[PDB]
């Protein structure tokens, strides 16, 4: 049958690209940077304590200018926090109290969420007449909005829980390229920083790394185990990190093409539901469903710290564009900010 | 002296945000939401078009907002989805209760309702929430049993020495083996509810009578329940 | 990556036996709760039996109790199911499933139409 012979090409390809991989492994992260001097106790403090939010925390953005901030919950509300005067800016109620996830734009002019209604809504904050309303509805996803990052004022990216990732033309409200490929829910989507490219990891234990132009998956990557919730592009912009249901972080090359180290413990056996890299990608903090959060040795995979004091579930987490704190949100509508 | 109105204008808005903040939790800690879970043929549309006729109330969900007494509820059933659901049934972790609907007449799907309501029951994030089993569909139960073409132990080998319970409400005109067959599949599903349950959650099985409107009211007695026993574990008394 | 290849399924005159297999690689086998699912033809995909991960607690369907065996061998990361007195309708595609997140005792979409932690399946046809 031509079924069994598609099969059989198949896993011979991926036998080839195992082979590949396994001979362009010459050494370990770990065999390399194993000279380096580990960073010392790494201790944060709560700084603030944004409260308001009624439901749990479902996502968070930081802003471009590092001080304002955009967060979602399960009430159906989007409060923009001043974070360094713990003032709230804005509290935009919405149409559907069932959202996954929040954005903030590049230019801090608009913000984007979405979630069971499988729409991507658009809020003008900075308008004439000051008052936040819906500019852009945009429709078209099969299933629940996962995540969602502005490429500029006018393109954004959202995966969805339909297998399928999409680039908006908002001005238009139509989908300018659709990415297909995944077999499983995507969860998460990292925009590269020269925003040309962008990966995602879905529920079918695999993150693939898109082309925006040309919309085709360059690479994909199949290291973990379980879902993935999480995923964050290196500041680099050569390697990511992604967290997963099988308690494991795992760091992968984009020009190795394959896995470099993992981050896991015995005494972990909680899923992971964000993951974010420090300034100088040094770090990788790393919420869990155990209520805290992990700061991990980017490079020597040791458990530097713990970012402990969440009553509920971590679910976001967010390092500033500066570096100079992180925020972490969780299912007992509190938002933290550490440094 | 920019920063200091800049700062005393934030400060007023950052009052008027929580004054509507305190507002809008007044009414959300007030209002019951209740989750609609079931099959394709549990018939779960039928439950909300009488709840939406009998109040007056009310995409990707199947809102529908309406007061019975004095008191605010939401009903809503996620469909447009995927058939996927270990995702998004962790947005309904703080729900005040899972309508869950059963076809009782449909034998050869009654071990997929089974699985799903173990799966539910047993979920990590939806271990505290209490579930009102909806076991619609009586009648055609009534005339499967009564007809004797499909008979309950070819699928069920565990029937043949299944007896009804002492605490069985003889409805009139009911035969022995309708209520029989009721009890069993009613049993079938509380012996996962108290398996794992622990006192965490409960659940409230009812047969459907018939299209009345006791369904709303045993609806209204469970949540009302649910939210006795909350208070009563909140004040450390349960 | 995770994959689960199954095999020993084949023509089987009725009342006969057969096993199964499901060669588990790329993820750790101790630490999931297996699956066992079928489809026959013209049908939707339906849960068979279940196994936890120390192999303690088991469940089957009612149509396959006592005939159906579920076992599991955490040394050669394999699960079995030996199936004794199989009938007509017992023909489907028998699929080796596993539950999406480990050390956790529910099982959530195991059934579906389209599922990653699933095994392309082995023919089991019963016919005199």
């Known amino acids: 049958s031509e079924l069994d012979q598609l099969r059989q090409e198949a896993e011979q390809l991926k036998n080839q690209i195992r082979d590949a991989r396994k001979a362009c492994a010459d050494a370990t992260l770990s065999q390399i940077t194993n000279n380096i001097d580990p960073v010392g106790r790494i201790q944060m403090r709560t700084r603030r304590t944004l409260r308001g939010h009624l439901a749990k925390i479902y996502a968070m953005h930081w802003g471009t200018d590092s001080r304002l901030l955009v967060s979602a919950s399960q009430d159906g509300k989007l409060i923009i926090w001043d974070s360094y005067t713990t003032n709230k800016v804005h509290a935009i109620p919405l149409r559907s109290s069932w959202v996954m996830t929040c954005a903030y734009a590049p230019s801090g002019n608009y913000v984007a969420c979405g979630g069971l209604d499988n729409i991507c809504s658009i809020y003008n904050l900075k308008t004439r007449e000051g008052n936040v309303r819906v500019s852009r509805e945009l429709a078209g996803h099969t299933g629940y909005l996962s995540c969602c990052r502005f490429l500029d004022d006018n393109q954004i990216v959202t995966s969805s829980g339909d297998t399928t990732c999409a680039l908006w033309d908002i001005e238009t409200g139509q989908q300018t390229t659709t990415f297909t490929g995944h077999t499983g829910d995507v969860m998460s989507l990292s925009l590269a920083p020269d925003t040309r490219l962008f990966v995602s990891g879905a529920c079918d234990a695999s993150a693939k790394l898109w082309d925006v132009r040309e919309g085709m998956c360059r690479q994909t990557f199949t290291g973990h185990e379980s879902d993935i919730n999480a995923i964050c592009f290196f500041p680099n912009g050569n390697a990511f990190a992604t967290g997963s249901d099988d308690a494991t972080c795992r760091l992968f090359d984009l020009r190795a093409d394959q896995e470099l180290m993992t981050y896991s413990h015995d005494n972990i056996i909680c899923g992971i539901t964000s993951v974010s890299f420090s300034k100088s990608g040094r770090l990788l903090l790393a919420g869990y469903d155990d209520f805290n959060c992990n700061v991990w040795d980017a490079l020597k995979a040791d458990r530097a710290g713990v970012l402990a004091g969440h009553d509920n579930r971590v679910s976001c987490l967010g390092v500033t564009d500066d570096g100079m704190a992180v925020a972490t949100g969780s299912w007992d509508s509190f938002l933290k900010i550490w440094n | 002296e920019d920063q200091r109105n800049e700062e005393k204008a934030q400060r007023e808005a950052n009052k008027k945000i929580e004054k509507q903040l305190q507002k809008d939790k007044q009414v959300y800690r007030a209002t019951h939401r209740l989750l609609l879970l079931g099959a394709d043929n549990s018939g779960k549309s039928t439950i909300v078009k009488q709840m939406r006729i009998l109040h007056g109330g009310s995409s990707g969900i199947f809102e529908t907002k309406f007061q019975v007494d004095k008191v605010n509820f939401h009903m809503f059933d996620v469909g447009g989805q995927r058939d996927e659901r270990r995702k998004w049934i962790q947005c309904f972790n703080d729900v005040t209760a899972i309508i869950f609907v059963v076809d009782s007449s449909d034998y050869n799907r009654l071990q997929e309702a089974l699985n799903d309501f173990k799966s539910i029951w047993n979920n990590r994030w939806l271990r505290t929430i209490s579930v009102i089993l909806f076991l619609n569909k009586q009648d055609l139960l009534a005339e499967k049993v009564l007809a004797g073409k499909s008979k309950i132990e070819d699928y069920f080998p565990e029937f043949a020495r299944y007896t009804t319970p002492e605490d069985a409400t003889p409805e009139p005109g009911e035969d022995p083996r309708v209520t029989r067959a009721k009890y069993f599949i009613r049993d079938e599903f509380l012996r996962i509810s108290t398996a794992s349950g622990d006192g965490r959650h409960y659940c409230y099985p009812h047969f459907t009578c018939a299209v009345d409107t006791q369904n709303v009211k045993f609806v209204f007695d469970a949540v009302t329940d649910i939210i006795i026993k909350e208070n009563l574990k909140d004040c450390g008394l349960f | 990556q995770v994959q689960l290849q199954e095999s020993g399924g084949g023509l089987v005159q009725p009342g006969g036996s057969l096993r199964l297999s499901c060669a588990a690689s790329?993820?750790?086998?101790?630490?999931?709760?297996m699956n066992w699912v079928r489809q026959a033809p013209g049908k939707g995909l339906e849960w068979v039996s279940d196994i936890s991960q120390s192999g303690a607690s088991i469940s089957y369907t009612g149509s396959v109790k006592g005939r159906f065996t579920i076992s599991r061998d955490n040394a050669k990361n394999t699960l079995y199911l030996q199936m004794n007195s199989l009938k007509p309708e017992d023909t489907a595609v028998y699929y080796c499933?596993?539950?999406?997140?480990?050390?956790?005792?529910?099982?959530?979409?195991?059934?579906?139409?389209?599922?990653?932690?699933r095994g392309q399946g082995t023919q089991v046809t019963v016919s005199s």
């Open positions: 790329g993820f750790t086998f101790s630490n999931y709760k």
């Open positions: 499933a596993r539950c999406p997140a480990p050390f956790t005792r529910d099982c959530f979409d195991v059934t579906s139409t389209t599922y990653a932690y």
